[PDB]
From a paper:
Here, we used hybridoma screening and antibody humanization to identify a high-affinity antibody, MW11-h317, which specifically binds human PD-1 and effectively blocks PD-1/PD-L1 and PD-1/PD-L2 interactions.
The complex structure of human PD-1 extracellular domain (residues 21-167) with MW11-h317 Fab fragment was determined and refined to a resolution of 2.9 Å, with Rwork and Rfree values of 0.207 and 0.247, respectively. PD-1 and MW11-h317 Fab formed a 1:1 complex. The binding interface was formed by residues from the loops of the IgV domain of hPD-1, including the BC loop, C′D loop, and FG loop. Importantly, all of the six CDRs of VH and VL of MW11-h317 Fab contributed to interaction with PD-1. Specifically, the side chain of R86 in the C′D loop of PD-1 entered the hydrophobic pocket formed by F27 and Y32 in HCDR1, Y106 in HCDR3, and V2 of heavy chain. The glycans linked to N58 made direct interactions with V domain of the heavy chain, burying ~500 Å2 of surface area (the average value of two complexes). The FG loop residues of PD-1 (I126, L128, A132, and I134) and V64 in the BC loop created a hydrophobic region with the residues of PD-L1 (I54, Y56, M115, A121, and Y123), and the hydrophobic amino acids in the BC and FG loops also interacted with the hydrophobic residues in VH (Y59) and VL (V32, W50, Y91, Y94, and Y96) of MW11-h317 Fab. These results indicate that the blocking mechanism of MW11-h317 is dependent on the CDRs of MW11-h317 Fab, which introduces a steric clash to abolish the binding of PD-L1 to hPD-1.
Numbering used by the authors:
A (entry chain B): 1 to 214
B (entry chain A): 1 to 220
C (entry chain C): 30 to 146
Amino acid sequence: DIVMTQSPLSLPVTPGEPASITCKASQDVETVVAWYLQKPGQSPRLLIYWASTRHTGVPDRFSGSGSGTDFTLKISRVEAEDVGVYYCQQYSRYPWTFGQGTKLEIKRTVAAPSVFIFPPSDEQLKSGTASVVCLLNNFYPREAKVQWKVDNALQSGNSQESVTEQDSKDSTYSLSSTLTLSKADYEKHKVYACEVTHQGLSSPVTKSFNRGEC
Amino acid sequence: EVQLVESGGGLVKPGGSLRLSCAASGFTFSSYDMSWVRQAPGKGLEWVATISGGGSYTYYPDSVKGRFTISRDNAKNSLYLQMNSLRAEDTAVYYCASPDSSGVAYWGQGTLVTVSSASTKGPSVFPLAPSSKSTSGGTAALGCLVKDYFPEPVTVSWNSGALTSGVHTFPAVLQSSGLYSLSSVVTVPSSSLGTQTYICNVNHKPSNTKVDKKVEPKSC
Amino acid sequence: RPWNPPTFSPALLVVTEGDNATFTCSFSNTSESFVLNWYRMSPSNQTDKLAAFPEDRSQPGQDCRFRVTQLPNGRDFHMSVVRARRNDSGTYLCGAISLAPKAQIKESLRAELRVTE
Ligand SMILES: *[C@@H]1O[C@H](CO[C@@H]2O[C@@H](C)[C@@H](O)[C@@H](O)[C@@H]2O)[C@@H](O[C@@H]2O[C@H](CO)[C@@H](O[C@@H]3O[C@H](CO)[C@@H](O)[C@H](O[C@H]4O[C@H](CO)[C@@H](O)[C@H](O)[C@@H]4O)[C@@H]3O)[C@H](O)[C@H]2NC(C)=O)[C@H](O)[C@H]1NC(C)=O
Ligand SMILES: *[C@@H]1O[C@H](CO)[C@@H](O)[C@H](O)[C@H]1NC(C)=O
Ligand SMILES: *[C@@H]1O[C@H](CO)[C@@H](O)[C@H](O)[C@H]1NC(C)=O
C-alpha cells in the first residue's frame, strides 16, 4: 500500500494569485501520478497525467511537476472556477491510492454574518418535536461559533450545525445551528437565545425570542 | 464522446447484496480497462476494482476483496460490480470509470449506494416563517425544515425554480433516529413578505414524496 | 514479473513517394493492461506521438494517415503510414506502457524511413 500525502488540506487563495499543492508518495512511484479536480456535486475530472502532461482541454494555467516521491500541482492564476477538491493519485502499483483531498477556497474580505433565529413552528409542535434554528448567513471566513442559551443556561451537545460550501458568487459561507428538544422540554422554558462569535463581529451577537409570543 | 452511465444503486440493509451496472459508449469497449471508484459522502476517493479489456485480469483492494466482484460483458458494452455482504462503511457514491496511461481519465456520474437498517421514509416539511426575529437590515430570512427522511437524496427548490438567488440548502445531517434532517433558507427583501408568495418544493424520490409548503410570515 | 521491451522491424525501410510503408511492433505482454504508442523523432531526442493502440480517446480527429492495427496473434501490431510524403521520412519507434502489475514504459529500438522521389 502506497500512501499519497497531500499538503495542505485547505488552500485559501486570492483570485489571480498562484496556488500550489504538494503530494508526497510513501515510496518511489516514478512519474505515474495524476491530478484531479472535483467541483462540489460533480464527478472528478482529470487535470494532469504522468506527473506533468496536461489532459485534453485543461487550461494552460494548470501545470504539474515532480518525480520519484515528490510532486507538485501549480495553478499560475487562480480563477473563481477552480474551487473544489484537488486529488493526487498514483497508478504505478495496485492498489491505486488517492490523496486525502485539498479544498481550494477563494480568499476574500472578512464579512460578518447576518444572524437570524426561527422558533419552532406551530405545525411541528403539534407533532411532538421542536427545532429552534439559528441561521448565520453570508460570512467569511468559515470559522464561526454558536452558543445556545436557554434561560441563560448554556447548552452543550444538544445542537447540530451544518455549513454550506463556499458560494460561487460572493465566496461566502452560511451556517445553520438547529437545537432540537422534545415538546415537553421546549414548553418548560421561556427565553431561547443564539449567540454568534465571528472574526467580523466586534462583540458576540445574540438573537433571542420568548416562547409563545409568535 | 466517451459516455459512462451507472445504474442499480439504492438502499440495502446490512449484509444484503446489490449489483451495479455501467453502460459505455464512445470507444471500443473491449480494448480498455474498466474500473469502479467510490467516494463516501464528504470524504475522499477510494479505488474499488479494475478489470482488463479482455476480462481475464481483475484487481481488488483488501477492503472489498472477497465481497465485491468486477465483471464485464464485451458483447454488450457494459460493466458490472456485484456487491455482496455489504457493511455500513460501504455506503458511498460509486463511479464507474475507464483508466488508461493518462490515469482515470473518464468518470461516470456515480450512483449512490446506502447501507443502513433504517426504513424508507418521506420527509416532514415544516416552515421557518420570517418574523421580527428573522429580520436584519431590510432583509428577512425564511426557509424550510425538511426533517426525518431516508435515504438521500432530497431536492429543494423555491417557487418552482423561479427563486434561486440567495438560496442556501444546507448539507443534511444524520439524526439519532437514523434519518436525515435538513434546512433550506432564503433571504428576501422585507417588503416582499406581503406580496410575494414563497412556496417550498421538496422532492424525495426514494419514497416518491412531493411536498409543497407555503411559508407565510409571522405578524411579529 | 520482468518483461522485455518491444521490438520494431524493419530496422530500415525505403519507399518511393505515394506508397504505403508498414512497420511491425512486437510486444510480449505479461498482463492485459497496456498501451502501445508509435513515436516519430525530433532532432532533440524528443518523443512525438503519432498514434497508439488502443486508440487515444482524449484527442480524437487525428491524422488518419498514421494507423496502428492489432494483429490477432496476441503480440504483433502494424504501424503503417499510408500515402507517404517526402517529409514523412525520419526516425520512428514504438513504445509499450504497461499499466499492471507495475506502470512502466519501455521503448523499442529506433528505425528509419526514407521516402524518395
Ligand atoms: C497480451 O495481450 C493480448 C491482447 O490484449 C488486447 O489488447 C490490449 C491492447 C488490451 O486492450 C487488452 O485488454 C486486449 O484484450 C491478450 O489477448 C486477449 O486475451 C483475451 C482473453 O484471453 C481475449 O479475449 C477473449 O476474446 C473472445 C473473442 O474476442 C471473447 O469471447 C472472450 O470472452 C469470454 O471469456 C470471458 C472471461 O475472460 C467471459 O467473461 C466472456 O463471457 C466470454 O465467455 C475474451 O474476451 C482477447 O481476444 C485477446 N486479444 C488478442 C488481440 O489476442 C493476451 O491475453 C495478453 N497476454 C497476457 C499474458 O496478459
Ligand atoms: C494504403 O492503405 C490504404 C488504407 O489501408 C489502402 O486503401 C490502399 O490500398 C493502400 N495502398 C497500397 C498501395 O497498398
Ligand atoms: C509535409 O508536407 C505536406 C505537403 O505535401 C504538408 O501538408 C504537411 O504539413 C507536411 N508535414 C510536416 C510534418 O511538415
